Amino acid sequence: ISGYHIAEAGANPISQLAFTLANGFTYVEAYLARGMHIDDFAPNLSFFFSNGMDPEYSVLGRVARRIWAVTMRDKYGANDRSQKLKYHIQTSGRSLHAQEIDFNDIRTTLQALIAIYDNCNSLHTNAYITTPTAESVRRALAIQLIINREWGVAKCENPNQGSFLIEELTDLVEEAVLQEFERIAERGGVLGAMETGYQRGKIQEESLYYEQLKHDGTLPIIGVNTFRNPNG
Amino acid sequence: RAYHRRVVAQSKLARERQQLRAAHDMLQGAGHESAALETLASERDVSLGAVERKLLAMWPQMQQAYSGDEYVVKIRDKEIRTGLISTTLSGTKIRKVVLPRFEDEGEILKWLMRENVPGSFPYTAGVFAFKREGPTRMFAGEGDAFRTNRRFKLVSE
Amino acid sequence: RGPANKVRFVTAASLFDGHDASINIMRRILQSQGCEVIHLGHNRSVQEVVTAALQEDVQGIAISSYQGGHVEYFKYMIDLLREHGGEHIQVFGGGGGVIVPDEIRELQAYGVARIYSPEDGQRMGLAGMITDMAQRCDIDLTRYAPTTLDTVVAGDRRALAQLITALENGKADPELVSALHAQAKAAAVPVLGITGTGGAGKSSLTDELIRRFRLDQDDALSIAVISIDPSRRKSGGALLGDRIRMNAINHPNIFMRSLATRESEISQALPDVIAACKAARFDLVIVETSGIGQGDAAIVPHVDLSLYVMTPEFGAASQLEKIDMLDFADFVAINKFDRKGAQDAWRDVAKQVQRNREQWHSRAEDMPVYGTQASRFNDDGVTMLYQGLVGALGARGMSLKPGTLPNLEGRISTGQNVIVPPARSRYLAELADTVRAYHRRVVAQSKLARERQQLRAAHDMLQGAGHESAALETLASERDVSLGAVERKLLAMWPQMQQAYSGDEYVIRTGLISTTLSGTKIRKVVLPRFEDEGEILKWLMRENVPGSFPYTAGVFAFKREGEDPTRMFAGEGDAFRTNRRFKLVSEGMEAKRLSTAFDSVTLYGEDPHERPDIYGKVGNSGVSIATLEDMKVLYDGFDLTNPSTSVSMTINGPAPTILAMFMNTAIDQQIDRFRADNGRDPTADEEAKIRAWVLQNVRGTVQADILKEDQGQNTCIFSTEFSLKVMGDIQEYFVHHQVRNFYSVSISGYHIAEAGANPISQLAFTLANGFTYVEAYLARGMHIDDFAPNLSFFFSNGMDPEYSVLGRVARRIWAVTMRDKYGANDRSQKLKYHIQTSGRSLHAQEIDFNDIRTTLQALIAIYDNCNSLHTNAYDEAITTPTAESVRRALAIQLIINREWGVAKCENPNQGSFLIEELTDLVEEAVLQEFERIAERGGVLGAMETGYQRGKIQEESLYYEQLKHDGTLPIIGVNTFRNPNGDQTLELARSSEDEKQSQLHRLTEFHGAHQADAEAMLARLRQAVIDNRNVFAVLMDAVRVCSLGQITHALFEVGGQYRRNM
């Protein structure tokens, strides 16, 4: 189950996380209605998220894990292996720009950081437009190596835990997802919503809103709509 | 949402239960022996769920586990030791998993139900106990099956 | 087994260079491999290093040059060596990424043996370089030794230096040796022996005595100095650390040779070396021994006059009866007379010497026992001892002119200056107690608050069930009184506190909410959701919200709306070019926050000059500022008196002089602004109003932290005590003129850290230095609330875990101590600091990786709510930030501040289990270090031993041992190397025209004030002599005098810094 494309298309972290979990649960309900056992396919379910600059991305993973674990245990009554949501996080490619390509390594670093902080299972790091050169992939691969090996805070495996901001954000994002679950449910489920093009519409709506505030100068992007290259 | 409602209620019970027994010990330390408090406390031992009661019960044992320099856990007939400490250049001990220092059992249970340590339900801080030490996948795909294969064999040499 | 021959080295840092971290760990490996190292320390001209190497007759010279101008520097050295009989001496260099490959090939082609790049260090290893360096210099220099005394007696000082190397190694012909002693006997020159306990001040006192000889006799005397230091027989070599303390030996008539004991406190060939100097027609030979015990006195039979040096600390008075040297010494110098018990120490020693000589018919005060303070410039005590030595040397056949010095009377120095009174000696220890005591209260009050809540909670639950027991309430009300007044109000205001940070605004109105693209409300300050009042109070006392005691999460309520903490360090070329770079950095920002970097020449208070030593360094590591006119140009277009403009100049040694330039500039800008807005010059009264107003509202910061100069950066040019004296003058000037916006000192540790100190050492030393200034000003008679708000701090942020909580720890330690210990007000309890990302953490290999590290470091700085942040460029290891390079650095801050989501919260650190634990640990670690410094006599007492410098250099070695090792992984350096091995990067060097510009501007400035120059400088020296306010005169001095003129004038009256290894 992926949500990389949904976010990349323009969906904000709440929409991405909500839709993706919704899609995942749809597969679960789909396999269950074939008379199958929950402990037979749930451990095989892998997830795939995006990490951008938005605050919600810092707690996206932990929220996904809790919503899954609680539901898989209480609702579907599955075993321990099934309650464990494993996911891959890939840094947002949308968040990187063609103008001042050297700046992208900064953004890709911050995004890679909160992924490791929130104890992800798998991480991809984006390069700083052109072809994937062997030099460009090394700078991307170095971001992970520097954080994992050199970075001091990273030596702790639960640095997020305890933080007032993290716990509040975790609760908020969780509830925001739940409310979106309800919105999809009153549209006939995920399939029923797709029948109306609800998800597509909502993604398209948010993609425009982002692309608007970007041009509006309201959402600052360093090197793009502010602090632009004085040469070109 | 129902799960969270339970966390709130069970925390209140665990909190009240502690507050009562705490006051009970303080009264006996001053001379007054009022078992009227204990009745309300024992009343909340049953009010607390089975799962919730064991969570608080394992908390002191949980603390002693993540306290030392290693993590002893015996699976099958052998055991699996894991290091907890990474020492800085300054000589500071950075624990892999840092536990809360709450006194309130209301906060302890609340934390144990909403965000237990990595490798424990609801796996908020991770699905595994500790991170694996040392995984970089080898991606390739271009041209015909022959070219993609060679790259596969080359990278994975 | 070490080297085959007696291998000797001369190690130093280049002219106007403070980078000793590199060269210090090289002289350590040199010494351990069995080399005698004559270490000269930092800031050494070519004329200095070459003269040293020639007199010591060494095989090798090791120089560190990180300021640039290294091409001209080494070329000069190579040329000068060949010109004066030192072609066979090999020169080695290193400057990290500063010396690019092309310049290495050039310099090595010129004559330099080897210059090691950071890549060389990785391949060869730390020991590998030194092994290569040592094996090259493993040659026998006895072949260059003279066979006849003809050269030496004639006055050849180079032949003398080589003859000594022959005599020391015993490769001199027996018939030549006896012939030397034969002529040495007929020479009849006096030999003064200086001996005494270890670290008493033998070298320092020797240097001072020589200075007295020069001033008194107008440099007419030819003095030979033979200093002996103990040799570690384990390694094979030694650390001859006497020459480094010598500042008055830089003259053609002075000759010095450093000898290792090579065993005894005297070299086995000392009588030969002495005789060699006697035959060289020197007017006087002075010999310094090593650390002698109580019963040691081997210097007596070899000299004509002996001087025993001791400190007031000798234990009981009965100990003096055990000291053999008190029985032979012709003169006894009780040095370090500023120490406690010096007066009583003199009476004991005087009476003991009287007893040993059986002169009962004489007064004890008439004995040749002198109380000296060699650390003190122009000390009357040292002069008294000198006058005595003159009278003794005079009777022993030594022609000397009637002295020009004050022929004073007495035996004891009258230096009554004190920085920190011995009563307050254990101030750091008290501070440690104060903090620990505060935490003990937090624990106890929390327990009470917890119990109080638990009781009343149980009381309400009983009444809800029926059984009412007022017995509980009695215990609760009992704890209402147990709780403090302050603590009770803290919990009382908590529900009101919650309602404040709950809404969308903070009622004067401030927004609390920043809404994401998803529509999530991110609160600026997130409050805890504890139910336990024990946890509430605990949190409110240990880490209250930003803007509340103890200001752990920040000293202010919310971060500034428009003025970001960004403040970019800048400086390149002349004042004109840097003025462009200021406008580049501060472009697009309504608030102009400038940070000025000066070139090595200005940093050391010197004027730009034609000599290659200095010329090549002009404007190459920072802006070259020499006159007030340069300073004016530097900040042209910038309204310094504007409320949204702050200038941060990084200058230490000449800081009072540079500050006076800045102040005059800020004043003159408003005078020009008035003359423009009114079309006329302001009246004497109008100008007075303007001038006074400028001083009050001018906003900025000058570093000037001299305590860190001795410890870390090495930009101290005057004597340590003098620098501190003038620094206080600045603060007193500030108080009088109500300069309440400018920071008189940026108490720093960045420099200490970059030298190699780990985050604990950095934070501890820096706070310790800060508290030292506090104690210094308090003993000096200033209200704590008068100078504490003017105290600025500066830290480093590296990769180490402790750096994440460095700032918050600094804030709490300060706030708690300033409140409980010193009883200061709110403004004083608030520690404001600047954080600059660690430059040493960035490397020359794979420079693109550095932006990753600089990002992470910049992040934790902003998370921990810093007041000011500088971000390093990716080409950090190679050059001063380029135009393209400074934008990438400046973008890191812009991306985090604007784009980064978590950053929308202003206390994201708070709550974290890791952060709170780390905060507690680092805090305690600092407090323990406070105690370690306290039991060494305070910060000053520790510096006297070189404790800080020692601890830094040790930690620097430990890090470096691991960086090359591999135990400490550095991506792109010791692991994950490039299969290629990597082009030409753009560099920030100064134009030739810019150098000639500065020279012409200087000579034009000098010509303009040629009349008032000498007069003003004379006034400046009189200000020091009459002990007035030095800075007050500098406010007028910088208008007619250049930086160099002022600095050199102060040298005649304030002395020069004495290096400390």
Ligand code: B12
């Ligand atoms: C630490 C440091 C400082 C510390 C110095 C601490 C101390 N007490 O020595 C502090 C903070 C005080 C400092 C201050 C300044 N510095 Co500085 N500093 C650095 C830094 C980060 C590292 C230098 C260092 O000590 N490295 C550790 C050594 C051991 O390793 P290495 O350099 O990689 O060297 C290796 C080999 O080359 C070999 N080698 C090197 N030297 C030698 C010598 C011998 C004999 C041998 C055998 C081998 C050898 O040994 C090493 C093996 O790995 C560099 C940038 C960088 N990372 O390169 C800037 C840098 C050198 N400093 C710089 C400047 C400009 C300054 C200032 C003048 C700034 C100012 N304008 O005020 C000040 C003032 C200095 C002064 N007071 O004279 C610039 C130089 C610019 C230029 N020359 O063009 C640099 C390059 C930073 C920059 N990009 O702007 N500095």
Ligand SMILES: CC(C)CC(=O)SCCNC(=O)CCNC(=O)[C@H](O)C(C)(C)COP(=O)(O)OP(=O)(O)OC[C@H]1O[C@@H](n2cnc3c(N)ncnc32)[C@H](O)[C@@H]1OP(=O)(O)O
């Ligand atoms: C050479 C090589 C080795 C490398 C180096 O060493 S580079 C060294 C460079 N050094 C530096 O960059 C040092 C820079 N540091 C400084 O200038 C000072 O230490 C600072 C205190 C950080 C200056 O910070 P600055 O931005 O000027 O802020 P101030 O504290 O002076 O503020 C002035 C007044 O404005 C108000 N204010 C400022 N910020 C806030 C706020 N957030 N909330 C509410 N009110 C605020 C407030 O009234 C304050 O004045 P007070 O009433 O507190 O006296």
Ligand SMILES: Nc1nc2c(ncn2[C@@H]2O[C@H](COP(=O)(O)OP(=O)(O)O)[C@@H](O)[C@H]2O)c(=O)[nH]1
């Ligand atoms: N407090 C104090 N320190 C001094 C005095 N004279 C020298 N020192 C310091 O004592 C230390 C060692 O001095 P040094 O000349 O090397 O002594 P030596 O090794 O025995 O010859 C240095 O830190 C000096 O600055 C003094 O009169 N008072």
Ligand SMILES: C[C@H]1O[C@@H](n2cnc3c(N)ncnc32)[C@H](O)[C@@H]1O
């Ligand atoms: C000691 C630290 O000083 C900084 N530094 C030195 N000179 C400059 C300059 N002109 N501009 C910016 N940073 C500078 C480097 O980042 C180095 O790491």
Ligand SMILES: [Mg+2]
């Ligand atoms: Mg000495």
Ligand SMILES: [Mg+2]
């Ligand atoms: Mg000595």
